Structures are given as C-alpha cells and as structure tokens.
Write a protein that binds this DNA or RNA. Structure first.
Lengths: 90, 56, 106
RNA sequence: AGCUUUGCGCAGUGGCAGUAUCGUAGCCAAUGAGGUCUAUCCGAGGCGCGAUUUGCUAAUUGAAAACUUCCCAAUAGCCGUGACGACUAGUCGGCACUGGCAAUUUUUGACAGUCUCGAGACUG
C-alpha cells in the first residue's frame, strides 16, 4: 500500500521488498559460469547440451531450431508483460 | 473420482486459457488438491502450486 | 539459401524416404517400380564431405494417387539393410512461414 | 396443393465408450435361443475370438528426436606527442596516440514535482 514517492528511492525499494522483487595474500574473487553468447545463463542441462554439441561438433537441426525459436519468442512475450471483454460481455 | 474430475476440469480450464495468460502460480485452498492438480497438468509445469493456509 | 528444390518443383507427390541405413539403398533407392515414374526427380540426401547419408531422402512420385497407393502398400517394406517407410514431405520454405504467421495469430 | 409414417444415405450437433461398439469368420439360429418371467405364456438371440480405428499439435528424453548442405575469417571527438608540406624561435591541414578529458563558459546534465488562464505562479 506504499505508492512510488517522487524524488525518493526508499519507497520503490520498499514496494519491491513487499511485492517480493528482491603467496601475495588475498581472497579469490572468482565466480565463473556458462552464459550463452546471447547473455542468457544456460541451464545446467542446457549447458551440458551445449558442451556435448561442441564436443560432437554438431548443432541443432531444423526442427530443433524451430522449437527453440518458438520457445524463445514465447518466453520473450511472457517477459514483456481479458478482463475488459469479460466485464463488457457480462 | 469426483475430486480427480474437478482437478482435471481445473487443468482443462487452465489449458483453455492461453499459455501467455497461464497463471504462473496456482494457490489452492484445498490441502489435498495440490497433488491431483500437479498430476493432471504435469505436461504444463509452468504453474507452481503454492499453499495458502489462510483460506480466503 | 539452398538452391535444391529448383530441380524438383514439378507439382508432383513428394514423400519423405528416411530412417534407412547409411549405405542401404545408396543408389537404387528409386529403382522400385510401384508406379510409372517411381521416385521421379528424387534421390537419397546425404551429409556432404563425409561419405555418409543423413537419413531422409527425396521421394517424389509424379502421380498422386499412385504415390499414395504405393506408400500404403509399401510402408516400411524391406529396403536394403534397413526397411524404411514413407511419409508426406514438408516443402515448407519461408513463403509458407510468412503465410502461417499471418494466418495463425490473426 | 402442403405435411408425414419405417425411416433410409449424406452432412452438423449431443452423448457414450471395456459391461460397451463391431466383425464374430467357431456354433445354434425365423423349420423357436431361452423360463421364476409370458407359463395351454412369449417367441430372436446366446455361447467363445479380437481390438476401439484416422490425423495434427505441443511438450519429453537424447549430443543429435529428422524433409535437400556445412563449421570458419578483415570486408562488401579534443589537448599534448614525431617528422613530413607551407608561411615569417612562432603559425596551419592531414598521419597514429606512447598520457589525460565526472570541479563554474559547451558532454557525464540544478533537475524534478504542483497549480491557473501559448503564458504565468508555488515548492523540494
């Protein structure tokens, strides 16, 4: 119930917290991962698939490419964002 | 059997709703209805069956 | 692009001949005489620069009814070292993808 | 002349689907298979076989889960710095930057919010 206050960053952080949006001698600052060239962090199953594709030197097929494109488009559309029609039809 | 039919009807109504409009979470008031809900629509696991103890 | 179907655009009945052996029916895949033109303008596709066949191979009969009858009568029949079956060809370029996208969401 | 009976076949709809639907090819069977029944009564199914066939789509696993080639490589701002060229130790165009460019006059933003009849006013 906390609105976005103007010229204030604590209100947006409170709304995000309420909505659930939140030897030389040294310590190693190492955190490695396997994120695809598109920037998406590949799943461990997907990472293993990519590694096996690289080892075998063979990529995805035509149908696999189509399925991947459809899944990526659907995921992007979902990440981008019928009540009015149900209210008008009632 | 009636409870299983109800869960199947709920899953079919979710499937009737578009995947882009599929509820990412499915809060069920009935305690024992979560397992049949997951079994009926295991092919659509994008919905998480979260518990809501305080029944509205 | 792939300039391959230019030698096979005949408005014939095209079928998918695949899941056979790598060497099975290597050159006689169209030698069958179940119809008049057999698999006209059709061969077995392969992976180039490897000496191996990638499964699916062209199967295009110029007679639609004869093609259907032969496919029904010779579905999965003994073909070389691996009996292969027949199924409808895709023939879905981008000229089909555009129309599919237009007619799906609209 | 309009309608309609057994309804038929086509096409649409509703529902059912292991007991069911059907062939039943083995057998009896309109020349009666069966009983408490209908019983001086009625007359058409039953025993056993086998399935519920046609396609599309998503997903699922896998390295690849299939529809006519493939992995590869370059392409298709300023100030100073060192000479090259010109003009009287000084000035200018271009060549790359071996250092810097978030501290008042240009680029790391004094911007944002509100009210009123293109313009004015208020606050942080």
């Amino acid at each position: 119930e906390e609105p976005i206050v103007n010229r204030g960053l604590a209100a947006a952080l409170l709304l995000c917290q309420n909505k659930g949006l939140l030897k030389d001698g040294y310590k190693p600052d190492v955190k490695i991962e396997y994120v695809d060239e598109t920037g998406r962090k590949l799943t461990p199953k997907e990472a293993f698939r990519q590694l096996s594709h690289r080892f075998h030197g063979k990529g995805s097929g035509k149908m696999k490419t189509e399925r991947r494109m459809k899944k990526l488009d659907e995921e992007a559309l979902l990440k981008k964002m019928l009540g009015t029609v149900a209210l008008l039809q009632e | 059997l009636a409870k299983w039919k109800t869960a199947e009807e709920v899953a079919a109504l979710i499937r009737s709703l578009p995947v882009e409009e599929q509820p990412k979470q499915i809060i069920v008031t009935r305690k024992g209805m979560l397992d049949p809900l997951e079994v009926h629509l295991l092919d659509f696991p994008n919905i998480v069956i979260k518990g809501s103890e305080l029944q509205l | 692009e792939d300039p391959s179907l230019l030698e096979w655009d005949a408005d014939d009945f095209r079928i998918f001949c695949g899941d056979l052996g790598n060497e099975v029916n290597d050159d006689i895949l169209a030698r069958a005489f179940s119809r008049f033109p057999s698999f006209l303008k059709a061969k077995v596709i392969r992976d180039k620069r490897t000496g191996k066949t990638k499964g699916y191979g062209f199967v295009s009969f110029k007679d639609p009814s004869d093609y259907v009858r032969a496919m029904r009568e010779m579905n999965g029949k003994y073909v070389g070292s691996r009996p292969i079956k027949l199924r409808k060809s895709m023939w879905k370029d981008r000229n089909l993808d555009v129309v599919r996208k237009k007619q799906k969401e609209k």
